[PDB]
Amino acid sequence: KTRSSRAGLQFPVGRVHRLLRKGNYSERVGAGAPVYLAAVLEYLTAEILELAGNAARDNKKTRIIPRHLQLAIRNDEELNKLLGRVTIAQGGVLPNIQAVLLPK
Amino acid sequence: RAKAKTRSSRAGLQFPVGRVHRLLRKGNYSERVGAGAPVYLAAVLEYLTAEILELAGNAARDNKKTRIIPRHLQLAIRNDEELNKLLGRVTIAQGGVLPNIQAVLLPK
Amino acid sequence: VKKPHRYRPGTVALREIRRYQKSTELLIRKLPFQRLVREICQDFTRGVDFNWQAQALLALQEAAEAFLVHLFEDAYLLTLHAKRVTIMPKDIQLARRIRGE
Amino acid sequence: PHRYRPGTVALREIRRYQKSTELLIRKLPFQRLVREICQDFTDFNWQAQALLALQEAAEAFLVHLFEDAYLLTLHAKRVTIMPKDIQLARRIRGE
Amino acid sequence: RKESYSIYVYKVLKQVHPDTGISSKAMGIMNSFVNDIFERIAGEASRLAHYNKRSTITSREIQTAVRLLLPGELAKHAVSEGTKAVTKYTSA
Amino acid sequence: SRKESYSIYVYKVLKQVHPDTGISSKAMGIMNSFVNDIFERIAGEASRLAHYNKRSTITSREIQTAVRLLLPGELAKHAVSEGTKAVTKYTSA
Amino acid sequence: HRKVLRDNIQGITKPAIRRLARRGGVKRISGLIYEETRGVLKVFLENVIRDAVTYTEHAKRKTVTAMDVVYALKRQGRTLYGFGG
Amino acid sequence: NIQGITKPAIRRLARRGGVKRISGLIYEETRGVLKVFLENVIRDAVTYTEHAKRKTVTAMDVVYALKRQGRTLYGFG
DNA sequence: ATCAATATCCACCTGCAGATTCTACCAAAAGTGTATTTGGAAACTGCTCCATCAAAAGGCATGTTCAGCTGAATTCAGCTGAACATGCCTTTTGATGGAGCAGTTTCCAAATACACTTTTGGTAGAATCTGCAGGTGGATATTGAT
DNA sequence: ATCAATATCCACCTGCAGATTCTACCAAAAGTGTATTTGGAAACTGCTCCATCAAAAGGCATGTTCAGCTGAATTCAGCTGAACATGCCTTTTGATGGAGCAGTTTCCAAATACACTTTTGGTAGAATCTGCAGGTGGATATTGAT
Ligand SMILES: [Cl-]
Ligand SMILES: [Cl-]
Ligand SMILES: [Mn+2]
Ligand SMILES: [Mn+2]
Ligand SMILES: [Mn+2]
Ligand SMILES: [Mn+2]
Ligand SMILES: [Mn+2]
Ligand SMILES: [Mn+2]
Ligand SMILES: [Mn+2]
Ligand SMILES: [Mn+2]
């Protein structure tokens, strides 16, 4: 009976709609705009959590922590460009030693 | 009916307070706009315009011309630290660059 | 006899640096630039023969030439940092990685 | 007596600290610095989370600046980060 | 009483990795991410509506904003999902 | 058809600072761009400030805070002086 | 229909790239710079033109305008002054 | 106070950044950059604080100050 | 240290493309007058934040030794700058047809407004579980001598 | 390249404290059912502005030659920076008290919105004005060979 359920979404269409009306974005908000925006947000969240669960169980854990999110984002070119001026608190950096610095 | 005075004249300004008010109310910035906010904004816009035109006139009569062209605006902005920081990601059409040859490249 | 006159390598380059840093004209020829823009626009799926107003083409060329000139300044800083005098592809690519591109 | 050659322990600490995410500046010196700068601007209080957020931002900024500057170090055929490298990286970034 | 996206992020995580969990700090990361992308899309859509002298933000402005803001394949998949949600919502 | 611009006021301010200097049309276009850009910056930051603090009205206080946040140093000091002085003179009568 | 446009990045001649480099202060130019510059210029133009025509077609037009180019540049953090019509 | 940013701490920051060898004049250089950074952020942060008429800067104030310098930070609300 | 060869600079001039002034209309401020909001002034209250204290540890400051990097100095093959002849194609200017922007009108599919009913998301303990401190013990790398 | 001798790394464990999950309650959003209003889509239409067209001339792109200077490759000593042992003090950690300050409520006095109705500033051409572009030709600086 909720708008999210009718669009087949987990993210909240009605809350997205209220945030749109109260964010001083436009005098009016159409019926489909919160549905479209909620769906896009749920998609991007799904992509990130997919890669982060993978990275978290690659290192023998079942708990997503910031480090897993950081490895996920930085190791994927399109996510990395989308979040290129964002810093993930306690996420550290990617392992990276320039090859000229190894012995031999 | 009383004599029509403009909001700019009552604020002692050249920039148009009423047009700034209309632009503020119709830009979907907030449901309401206070009476003094367009005055304050028109005054800041006029101040910054005066600063750029002061420095650009200086550059134009340093180059012995009486009309400001884009090159003068660019010399004005780049030769002033604070304007340069404020317009650091701005491109000025046909403004060129500041002369700058690194000293290492002059003959020995 | 006579020798034909000849400037030493570097003199004319500094002459043209001076000449082009005091001027503001567009440095790419206008028509080839507009053909490049039109070709890229067509080769893009959302281009179904869009027209271009003249001001739009001038705006693009202004932006593109400012971008290239500043990229050359940055890459040349890197060139000089490497104790070289010849700009090299490496310098341009490193300058744009550090810029954030 | 055992002694590692210069460089070996450095690469070990590179590996140790790039795999970790702990803050690398000690808390009290950093928060004391922050409060001093805040007073030298303004007598404000600080949320604890606010100080932690500041320190994360500052350490991330410093680490990425070191990465960029080291790119310049290696471009100049060196291995030793130098002040010139950091200054040139901040010029090229646009600060 | 403070709102957040934690409920829905946890739902999506259970969909994608049923037996993986998430720490409190990473949940804050995800809230920050959702709010950031929301402000990005909503702001771009607001500017689009304004440029064209329209007063209503419609799913067409959201779609153009997603095209402008996401890179490549991410944009294609987000546009597909958004259009699909609008269709299913209009059907019911 | 009818297009508004800031050209009138830019020219008035130019005569104030440089009575015997003129301005070419391309340079006037630069100046129009400048006024619209700074307007958008200040107004956007003021909108964000009002929203953060759950106020529905943008007042001159939000304009002042945004001017402090967006302009550098001495520019910000002098801009605040001019804005405050214009607001007091306008409100007196 | 127009005539067919092909291989136009080669119209960005070597002397034009030299002039751009001189305005940028470069005194000596490696022979491989010209193809690099063409690559970079094409990537730049593609990103901006893609965004410009997105604005154009959202506005239900068949004509790219100067404002469309200005909006696309500003969405790449490259504000351009002088073309506000 | 700037000396509380110890040399081993700067060394650690550099190692996270991949630097293998570190010149002796980097540390005071690093302190300089950090000071500028902190000033720029704190000035903006407390500005937000005093606009809301508060005497306690919050994490959200820091987040707003960072984002207005183009350095969005995730994780603090 | 000079001269011949160029390049650059600089003053002066005039016609015209571009900039500045001048008119008249009219959209859009300004003025008026009621109708809605709202932003704090006082009055609370519970809780984060600061301020002292105190003890301890574990991280840092210091001094020593020396290995290896950086900057300097050399050498040289070949790449890139300079100069130039040739001739192509860009730039100008003007025309010509028509696409398609933009101005205007009409009218619903969609959006807002409002009064009420459900449903949810947030919160805070209770009930479960999971990393993690702090141990191995083998694997894997490093160092010095042959 | 090997062995022998350390040293560090890291995979794996356990018991359990601390972090999440799990329950249940409830203001507050979200949803619903009607009732009205309206923004902008369509459908013309008028007319700028783009797209080609053409021709002319003359500014430049191109290809070639060849020599000077650059990048690249090597060598190597002085001195900087790394590694490390020692012992000292700054930072951590924990407790306890209390101030002061962020939230919250309730009213209004003040401020702002909005519809109508004068009133004028601002805009679009026209009508005038006028720097300065773009020509000379001499003066003055710079460069490179001798
Ligand atoms: Cl819609
Ligand atoms: Cl106000
Ligand atoms: Mn094509
Ligand atoms: Mn030695
Ligand atoms: Mn529930
Ligand atoms: Mn352990
Ligand atoms: Mn209507
Ligand atoms: Mn050399
Ligand atoms: Mn009048
Ligand atoms: Mn001239």
Author numbering:
A (entry chain G): 15 to 118
B (entry chain C): 11 to 118
C (entry chain E): 35 to 135
D (entry chain A): 38 to 79, 83 to 135
E (entry chain H): 33 to 124
F (entry chain D): 32 to 124
G (entry chain F): 18 to 102
H (entry chain B): 25 to 101
From the paper:
Therefore, we propose that the CENP-A-mediated structural polymorphism of the H4 N-terminal tail is the structural basis for the specific H4K20 monomethylation in the CENP-A nucleosome.
We then determined the crystal structure of the nucleosome containing H3.1CATD(V76Q K77D) at 2.58 Å resolution. In the H3.1CATD(V76Q, K77D) nucleosome structure, the Q76 and D77 residues, replacing the corresponding V76 and K77 residues of the H3.1CATD, interact with the H4 R19 and L22 residues, accompanied by the H4 R19-DNA binding, as observed in the canonical H3.1. As a result, the H4 N-terminal tail conformation in the H3.1CATD(V76Q, K77D) nucleosome adopted the inward H4-N conformation, as observed in the canonical H3.1 nucleosome. In both the canonical and H3.1CATD(V76Q, K77D) nucleosomes, the visible H4 tail interacted with the acidic patch of the neighboring nucleosome in the crystals, and formed the inward configuration. In contrast, in the H3.1CATD nucleosome, the H4 tails in the outward configuration may not interact with the acidic patch of the neighboring nucleosome. These structural findings indicated that the H3.1 Q76 and D77 residues actually function to constrain the H4 N-terminal tail orientation in the nucleosome. To form the inward H4-N conformation observed in the H3.1 nucleosome, the interactions between the H3.1 Q76 and D77 residues and the H4 R19 and L22 residues are essential.
